[PDB]
Amino acid sequence: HCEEHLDPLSIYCEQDRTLVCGVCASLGSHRGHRLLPAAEAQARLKTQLPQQKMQLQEASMRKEKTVAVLEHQLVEVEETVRQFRGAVGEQLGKMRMFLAALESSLDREAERVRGDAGVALRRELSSLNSYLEQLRQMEKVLEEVADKPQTEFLMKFSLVTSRLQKILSESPPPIQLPVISDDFKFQVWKHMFRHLMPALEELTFDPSSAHPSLVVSSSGRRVECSDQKAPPAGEDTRQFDKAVAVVAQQLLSQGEHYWEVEVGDKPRWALGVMAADASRRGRLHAVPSQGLWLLGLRDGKILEAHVEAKEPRALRTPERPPARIGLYLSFADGVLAFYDASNPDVLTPIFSFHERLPGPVYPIFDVCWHDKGKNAQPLLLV
Amino acid sequence: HCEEHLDPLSIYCEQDRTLVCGVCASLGSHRGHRLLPAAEAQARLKTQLPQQKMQLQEASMRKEKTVAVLEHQLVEVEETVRQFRGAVGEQLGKMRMFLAALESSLDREAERVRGDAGVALRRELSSLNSYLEQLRQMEKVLEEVADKPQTEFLMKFSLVTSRLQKILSESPPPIQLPVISDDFKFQVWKHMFRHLMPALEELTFDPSSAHPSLVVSSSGRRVECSDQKAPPAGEDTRQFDKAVAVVAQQLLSQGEHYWEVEVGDKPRWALGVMAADASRRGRLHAVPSQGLWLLGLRDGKILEAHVEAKEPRALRTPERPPARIGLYLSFADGVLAFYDASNPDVLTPIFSFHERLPGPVYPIFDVCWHDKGKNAQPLLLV
Ligand SMILES: [Zn+2]
Ligand SMILES: [Zn+2]
Ligand SMILES: [Zn+2]
Ligand SMILES: [Zn+2]
Numbered sequence: 173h174c175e176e177h178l179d180p181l182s183i184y185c186e187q188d189r190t191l192v193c194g195v196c197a198s199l200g201s202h203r204g205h206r207l208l209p210a211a212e213a214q215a216r217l218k219t220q221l222p223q224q225k226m227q228l229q230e231a232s233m234r235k236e237k238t239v240a241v242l243e244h245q246l247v248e249v250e251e252t253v254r255q256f257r258g259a260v261g262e263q264l265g266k267m268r269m270f271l272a273a274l275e276s277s278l279d280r281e282a283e284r285v286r287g288d289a290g291v292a293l294r295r296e297l298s299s300l301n302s303y304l305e306q307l308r309q310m311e312k313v314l315e316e317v318a319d320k321p322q323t324e325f326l327m328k329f330s331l332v333t334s335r336l337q338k339i340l341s342e343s344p345p346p347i348q349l350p351v352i353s354d355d356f357k358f359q360v361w362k363h364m365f366r367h368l369m370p371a372l373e374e375l376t377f378d379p380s381s382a383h384p385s386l387v388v389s390s391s392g393r394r395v396e397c398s399d400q401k402a403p404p405a406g407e408d409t410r411q412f413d414k415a416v417a418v419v420a421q422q423l424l425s426q427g428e429h430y431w432e433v434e435v436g437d438k439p440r441w442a443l444g445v446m447a448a449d450a451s452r453r454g455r456l457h458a459v460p461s462q463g464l465w466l467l468g469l470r471d472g473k474i475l476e477a478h479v480e481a482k483e484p485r486a487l488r489t490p491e492r493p494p495a496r497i498g499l500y501l502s503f504a505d506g507v508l509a510f511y512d513a514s515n516p517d518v519l520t521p522i523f524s525f526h527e528r529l530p531g532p533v534y535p536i537f538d539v540c541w542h543d544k545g546k547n548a549q550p551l552l553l554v
Numbered sequence: 555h556c557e558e559h560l561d562p563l564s565i566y567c568e569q570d571r572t573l574v575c576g577v578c579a580s581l582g583s584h585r586g587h588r589l590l591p592a593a594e595a596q597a598r599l600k601t602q603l604p605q606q607k608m609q610l611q612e613a614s615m616r617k618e619k620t621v622a623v624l625e626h627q628l629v630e631v632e633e634t635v636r637q638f639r640g641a642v643g644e645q646l647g648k649m650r651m652f653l654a655a656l657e658s659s660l661d662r663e664a665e666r667v668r669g670d671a672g673v674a675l676r677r678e679l680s681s682l683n684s685y686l687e688q689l690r691q692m693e694k695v696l697e698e699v700a701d702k703p704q705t706e707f708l709m710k711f712s713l714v715t716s717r718l719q720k721i722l723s724e725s726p727p728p729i730q731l732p733v734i735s736d737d738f739k740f741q742v743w744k745h746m747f748r749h750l751m752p753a754l755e756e757l758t759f760d761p762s763s764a765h766p767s768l769v770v771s772s773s774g775r776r777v778e779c780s781d782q783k784a785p786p787a788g789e790d791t792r793q794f795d796k797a798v799a800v801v802a803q804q805l806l807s808q809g810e811h812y813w814e815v816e817v818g819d820k821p822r823w824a825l826g827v828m829a830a831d832a833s834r835r836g837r838l839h840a841v842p843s844q845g846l847w848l849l850g851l852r853d854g855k856i857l858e859a860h861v862e863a864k865e866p867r868a869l870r871t872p873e874r875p876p877a878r879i880g881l882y883l884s885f886a887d888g889v890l891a892f893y894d895a896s897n898p899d900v901l902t903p904i905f906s907f908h909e910r911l912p913g914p915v916y917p918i919f920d921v922c923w924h925d926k927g928k929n930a931q932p933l934l935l936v
Contacts, residue, residue, distance in 0.1 A: 173705075181705055189712040191705060214704050217711050221700055224718060228696070231722055232689045235682055242679050246672065249729055253668040256733050260660050263739045264653050271646050278642050286635040290628065297624050300617055307614045314610070318603055322596050323555075323563055323573060329599050330571040336606060340613055347631055351638050354810045354884045357645045357750045361743075368739045428736045502736045 184213035270367045274360065282349065289347045296344070303344055310336050362518045369430040369500065369519075375535055375553055378421035381452070383412040386539060396550040397542045413453050417538045423448065425532040428502040432513050432554035433537065436495050439472040440547050442538035443497055445508060449531060458484075465525050466538065467497070467510045477523040487523060494522070496554060503529060513554075566595035652749045656742065664731065671729045678726070685726055692718050744900045751812040751882065751901075757917055757935055760803035763834070765794040768921060778932040779924045795835050799920045805830065807914040810884040814895050814936035815919065818877050821854040822929050824920035825879055827890060831913060840866075847907050848920065849879070849892045859905040869905060876904070878936060885911060895936075 173180035174193035177200075181191035186206045196202045208216075317325060317332050376392040384402040386395050395418050405413045412418065424445070435441055446452070447463025458464045458478040466478040473493050476484035490512055498511035498519055506528035512520040539551045555562035556575035559582075563573035568588045578584045590598075699707060699714050758774040766784040768777050777800050787795045794800065806827070817823055828834070829845025840846045840860040848860040855875050858866035872894055880893035880901055888910035894902040921933045 181708075184708055191708050210704060210708055214707050214711075217708075217715075218700075220715070221696070224696060224715065225693070227722065228689060228693045228718065231725070232686060232693070235686050235689070235726075239679065239682050239686070242675055242682070246675050249668055249671045249675070252729065252731060252733065253664050256664055256731055257661060259734050260657055260738075263734070264657055264742070266739060267653055267742070268650065271649055275642055275646055279639060282635050282638055286631055289631045293624055293628050293631070297621065300621050300624070304614060304617050304621070307610060307617070311607070311610045311614070314603070314606060318600075322592060325596050326563075326566055326573050326592055326599075329596075333599075333602070333606065336610065340609065343613070344617075347634065349634060349638055351634065352641050352645070353886045355887050355889070356642075357648060360646070360649070361746060361750060364743060368743060504735045505737050507737070 182210055183207050184210050186213070266368060267364060270364055271360070274363075285347055285349045296346075300344055303342075306339065310339060365519050366517065369498075370428055371430075372554070373422070373424075373429045373431045375420035375422050375431055377418050377537070377551075377553070379418075380408075380421065381411055382418040383416040385416055385542065386418055388418070390552075393553040394550050395537060395539050397539055397548065399545075399548070407453075410452050415452070415456050415538060416541055417442075417452070417536055419446065419534040419536050423532050423534060424501060424503075426503055428500070428504065430498065430500050431535060432496055432498045434496050434552035434554050435469070436549060437472070437493065438469070438547065438549040438551070440468075440470045440540045440543070441551065442466045442468040442478070442540060443499065443510075444478075444536060445499075445501065445529075445533040446536040447530065447533055460525065460527055463530075463533075464536075465508050465527075465529075465533075466536075467523055468538075469493075475522065479525070485523075490520070490522075497522075499535070501533070564592055565589050566592050568595070648750060649746060652746055653742070656745075667729055667731045678728075682726055685724075688721065692721060747901050748899065751880075752810055753812075754936070755804070755806075755811045755813045757802035757804050757813055759800050759919070759933075759935070761800075762790075762803065763793055764800040765798040767798055767924065768800055770800070772934075775935040776932050777919060777921050779921055779930065781927075781930070789835075792834050797834070797838050797920060798923055799824075799834070799918055801828065801916040801918050805914050805916060806883060806885075808885055810882070810886065812880065812882050813917060814878055814880045816878050816934035816936050817851070818931060819854070819875065820851070820929065820931040820933070822850075822852045822922045822925070823933065824848045824850040824860070824922060825881065825892075826860075826918060827881075827883065827911075827915040828918040829912065829915055842907065842909055845912075845915075846918075847890050847909075847911075847915075848918075849905055850920075851875075857904065861907070867905075872902070872904075879904075881917070883915070 174196070177193045177195045179193045179195065182194060183192050183197040183202075184190075184207065185192050185197070185202045186208060188202065188205065191210065192202050192207070193200075197205075197207055314332060314336060317329055377388040377395045379388045379392070382388060382395065384405045385397050387398055388395055397416060405411050433443055435443075442458070444464070444466040446465075450463030456462065456464065458466045458468075460480045464478065468476045468478060468484065470476065473489055475487040475489060475494075477487060478484050492514065494512045494514055496513040498513035500507070500509040500511070507524060507526060508529075509524035510522040512522055537551050540547060542548060556578070559575045559577045561575045561577065564576060565574050565579040565584075566572075566589065567574050567579070567584045568590060570584065570587065573592065574584050574589070575582075579587075579589055696714060696718060699711055759770040759777045761770045761774070764770060764777065766787045767779050769780055770777055779798060787793050815825055817825075824840070826846070826848040828847075832845030838844065838846065840848045840850075842862045846860065850858045850860060850866065852858065855871055857869040857871060857876075859869060860866050874896065876894045876896055878895040880895035882889070882891040882893070889906060889908060890911075891906035892904040894904055919933050922929060924930060
């Protein structure tokens, strides 16, 4: 069975992993190799079978789990494209809802104006038609008395004359559409901004936090620093002891939020958000790395952003001292933007931080020192 | 016929404008009055009739014309409300057209991404299904050779072993949707602005006007000041002789217009509009009351508005020196606004005049002095 020495295969060559005849093995191709008897070779190779079997089983289970992961990835591609479509739909429907509402309201007002013009004009019209037929009647009553016997002419001519005269002097006495010009596009665009914001987050001045000088009122939505001297504050690690400030009890942790506060003519204040990880006791250092994101006003008109530096950044003083501040907070984009919100229609950006906030934050209102009575105005949540 | 003296009426009392008897007139109620005979009274009163008749005719014609004016005013109320509605429709359709187009384009891109994911994933999936069935075939081919007569086991076991081994090591190798976050509203809003503008007015550098140093190129839409020394200009009262400037041949007279000019890195220039009523010869004083509405750049980075004062107003230097200026002109609102237009998506306002321009204006481009070679860059109409 050697096929070359005609003598069957009985020796296994281990360096060539093939069978051989006794001669190839004695003095032939395989004379110097490592060889052993065939029975021992098969009994040595058979022992490797459990491990080859299990390496195959394990490889197949790996690939099966990968197949499972890919099959899941397909439906997650489906769902992701679905949510993308739906999110575009919803963010654009905000704008389309606004335009639709605006157009309908403009149209209602148009119809109102035009109908009122119609009735006013038609009234003056029918009252001239009456006056004009009175004139007609005068004219040919005058021609009735124009040619009649002498004495009856004398008996009524000058009553007719007087009547004519001052029904001539009884003569009758004599729109408001907001017609639109080129900057209307631009006014609608500027008004759309305020609507792009989320519904006003309805927060609450949290008396569990307020500095002992402050009082909350109007259902926890107005904070006022008091005429009177206050007791010292206890060591509750999140009541304010030195900085006269107060937080909302609502903790903001995800998504996007918008809120407005009415400052009016208050000469000094600060507004923004404080991290939950930083404590509120002792003197505070108003820079981001302390968990403080603050916009401030001092001396009635000087507006300072409290960004990570030594000095705060002076800002462009607006036309008027801002009477209401709007605050937009996006965690997804790490953004705290401050807006002049005195115009209830159009928002004007003051400043914005671009920092991914570490974790959850509280809206903080520094209703700053009463300073011997000159800063007694309140903070009002709009 | 007196009804009190029984004796007929024959005398007319002129101060009481009534008839009387001879007795009332002789010694009675009317004894001291002014009286005349009845025949003369009727012959005196009859003469006033033509003028009373014509005063009536003229009063009636006046009221008739007023009736005509009111009747016209009604249909003009109709047409005014119609045009108001249609103008709101059209200015808002601008915005709605934009949003619709944007949503469709986002959707097309979504489908593209998802289909390509589908094919890539399904390819890797069917190629693992093939690899896994190969593993199956390996496994029970291995079990076919696991238990067979000695020598044929030895004759093929280790070819099977090698095959298994490196088809095990032949193992297989291992989306891009622009998924949208909260500031997408805001990006779409900022991109809408550029679309609120009217179609680019397609102007032409008018060589009939250019200062003798300049050359127009690219179909009258690029002006460059030349290396070379120029001839003096003739006394055509609207060619520029001292200020090296050039106008569009298009005269703007009504409505609203928008155009963009590419300045790039040009260190010094001015752009804006010049009145047709002011002449372009000699040295020019760049303030409004001379018919010049100009924004300027000097020393590469300093941006000055040329408003009616002694000094020009310095402006906020943008992040980068602006590479393209956009100009919006509304006569209806008396407005010339300048925009940073380097971002082909979002426009940023530099400055705007708020003055009702007297009459028609030309777009003027001060392609300022070549200044011995350092300001040789061109002005390009976008
Ligand atoms: Zn042999
Ligand atoms: Zn050998
Ligand atoms: Zn009498
Ligand atoms: Zn009398």
